[PDB]
From a paper:
Our findings demonstrate that ESI-cryoPrep effectively confines macromolecules within the middle of the thin layer of amorphous ice, facilitating the preparation of blotting-free vitreous samples.
We acquired cryo-EM micrographs of the specimens and performed image processing for the five types of macromolecule, resulting in 3D reconstructions of the 70S ribosome, 20S proteasome, apo-ferritin, ACE2 and streptavidin at resolutions of 2.7, 2.0, 2.1, 3.3 and 1.9 Å, respectively (top). The zx slice of tomograms for the four types of macromolecule prepared by ESI-cryoPrep revealed that particles distributed slightly closer to the graphene side but not attached to the AWI. In ESI-cryoPrep data, the positive z heights of the 70S ribosome, 20S proteasome and ACE2 correspond to the AWIs, while the positive z heights of the apo-ferritin and streptavidin correspond to the GWIs.
Residue numbers in the entry: 1 to 597
Write the structure that this text describes.
């Protein structure tokens, strides 16, 4: 018939061959990421390059097809996803150099060891060690050793590689008819030509700026509280009113403040709801954590997990004999198999991460019936949002008492709510400003507003004015501190997590309203609420077949990301936290630092 039916047949044979090729390439990537060797680097690289070449030739074959013939909007979405000139636009030599840079950075981050001379010989890894050191130690010099070591012995390696990566990705994106590579990352969030549902990328950065500006008060108050507590626990190292050093955040870079809970518990005379001790005293392992996640998903109405998931998942650390990337991940490999890469420890952070990854897997399992090009979540934000909906619904004291892991006689009082909310605020409201600042730096450095050396200066300055976190030792232009993070050195997008927080809070509000939970939202548990699970199932089975705004309004009834549910979560918190800092200076001066005197 006409070219429309020809395009339909094109899509059919594409989806078949692409299913096969994607399964093979995903297998190669998985075997690289769990069994890191050189043979696996070669296998992953050649499989990925072959798949990319096939995708680019199919993309040209689709570029033969004007989109003006489209009646079915789903078909338009599929061809538009196929209409890319793609990252393969670059020259083969240039593409190989870029891939070399990316791989070199990936291995330097995931395997490069710390050998610092401040403790004159000290060599360790990122996994238990540096992370555990920054998470469990309450002494200044040890934290300074860890921080300065990771920054001056690993960032200096990645400074030239990140420079080359920035240049190559920026020019490739300009070849792809984009302003920069941050433009590619933002244009991932595009919605085009759907009856008034359209969404640009400049509107996305404007929305992120607006939401951050609205958030800022709460994070400022939480900052002031945690700084007062640290100065109480660190006598002569946190100077009175200003910021505090970067190694004092219970995390390597200062992304999560949940560990500071141990130091910043508001009411310690109550039973601990951050139950790591309860888990270890209950003889808990990774498998039981994952199985309780499966039980939660069954009880919310979603079907039980696949046997192949149990058989083929890397549910624990493979060991120190092989250096597998231990940053938790969730994988589709196609054809009906699903995997989780979790180096699971017995800790609330790992329990919540396991729930997050199981939500990822359920999201992946629901839309598997869709065609290949739409076999992906409506956004990265939606995947992570589903995962942390599950995580938030788990953490309620009522749920903890449901499995009997929390004592059945445990009493729910005001101080328990304050403890719960302070922990949740530490986590979420410590990620938010850090992610916003980090991707602001990445966006504006890709766009080219910063001279190359000035990179470093600019970076630190913005932290001092956005995250309220400073350095104790000078770092000139020869360092590369941003690359010290996983996502920065693995070509990831970090605003994904900001959208994650906002989306998960809107979804939790709407889903608890659907579940008819009676009471405040922050104790709502959507377990045993099969109809709520059915609604969520509809949303995350929709897939990418419709614009993400449509699924947004399908669940909550909004056309955009909103900050209202998040502030409705931490309202009793905000009250208590304001009540405590009534006699404290909430805020930090930009030119004010224990180092930058």
């Amino acid at each position: 018939s006409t070219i429309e039916e020809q395009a339909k047949t094109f899509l059919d044979k594409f989806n078949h061959e692409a299913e096969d090729l994607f399964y093979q390439s995903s297998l190669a990537s998985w075997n690289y990421n769990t069994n890191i060797t050189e043979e696996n680097v070669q296998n992953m690289n050649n499989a990925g390059d072959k798949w990319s070449a096939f995708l680019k030739e199919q993309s040209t074959l689709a570029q033969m097809y004007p989109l003006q013939e489209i009646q079915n909007l789903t078909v338009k979405l599929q061809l538009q996803a196929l209409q890319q000139n793609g990252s393969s636009v670059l020259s083969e030599d240039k593409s190989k150099r870029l891939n070399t840079i990316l791989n070199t950075m990936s291995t330097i981050y995931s395997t490069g060891k710390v050998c610092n001379p401040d403790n004159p010989q000290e060599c360790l890894l990122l996994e238990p060690g540096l992370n555990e050191i920054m998470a469990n130690s309450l002494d200044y010099n040890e934290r300074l050793w860890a921080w300065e070591s990771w920054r001056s012995e690993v960032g200096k390696q990645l400074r030239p590689l990140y420079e080359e990566y920035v240049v190559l990705k920026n020019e490739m994106a300009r070849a792809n008819h984009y302003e920069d590579y941050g433009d590619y990352w933002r244009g991932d969030y595009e919605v085009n030509g759907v009856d008034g549902y359209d969404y640009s990328r400049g509107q996305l950065i404007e929305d992120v700026e607006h939401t951050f500006e609205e958030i800022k008060p709460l994070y400022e108050h939480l900052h002031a509280y945690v700084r007062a507590k640290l100065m109480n626990a660190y006598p002569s190292y946190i100077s009175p009113i200003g910021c505090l050093p970067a190694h004092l955040l219970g995390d390597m870079w200062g992304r999560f403040w949940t560990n500071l809970y141990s130091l910043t518990v508001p009411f310690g005379q109550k039973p601990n709801i951050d139950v790591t001790d309860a888990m270890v005293d209950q003889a808990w392992d990774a498998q039981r954590i994952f199985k309780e996640a499966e039980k939660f998903f069954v009880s919310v109405g979603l079907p039980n997990m696949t046997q192949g998931f149990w058989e083929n998942s890397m549910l624990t650390d493979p060991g120190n004999v092989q250096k597998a990337v231990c940053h938790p991940t969730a994988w589709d490999l196609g054809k009906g198999d699903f995997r989780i890469l979790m180096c699971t420890k017995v800790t609330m952070d790992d329990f919540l991460t396991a729930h997050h990854e199981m939500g990822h897997i359920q999201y992946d399992m629901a839309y598997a019936a869709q065609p290949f090009l739409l076999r992906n979540g409506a956004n990265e934000g939606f995947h992570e949002a589903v995962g942390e909906i599950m995580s938030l619904s788990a953490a309620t004291p009522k749920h903890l008492k449901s499995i009997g892991l929390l004592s059945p006689d445990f009493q729910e009082d005001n101080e328990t709510e304050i403890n719960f909310l302070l922990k949740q605020a530490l986590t979420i409201v410590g990620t938010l400003p850090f992610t916003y600042m980090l991707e602001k730096w990445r966006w504006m450095v890709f766009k080219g507003e910063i001279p190359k050396d000035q990179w470093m200066k600019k970076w630190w300055e913005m932290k001092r004015e956005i995250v309220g976190v400073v350095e104790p030792v000078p770092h000139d232009e020869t360092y590369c501190d941003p690359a010290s993070l996983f996502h920065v050195s693995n070509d990831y997008s970090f605003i994904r997590y900001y959208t994650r927080t906002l989306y998960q809070f809107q979804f939790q509000e709407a889903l608890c309203q659907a579940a008819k939970h009676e009471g405040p939202l922050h104790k709502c548990d959507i377990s045993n609420s099969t109809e709520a699970g059915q609604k969520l199932f509809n949303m995350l089975r929709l897939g990418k077949s419709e614009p993400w705004t449509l699924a947004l309004e399908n669940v909550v009834g909004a056309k955009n990301m909103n900050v209202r549910p998040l502030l409705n979560y931490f309202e009793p918190l905000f009250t208590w936290l304001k009540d405590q800092n009534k006699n404290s200076f909430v805020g930090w001066s930009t030119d004010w630092s224990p180092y930058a005197d």
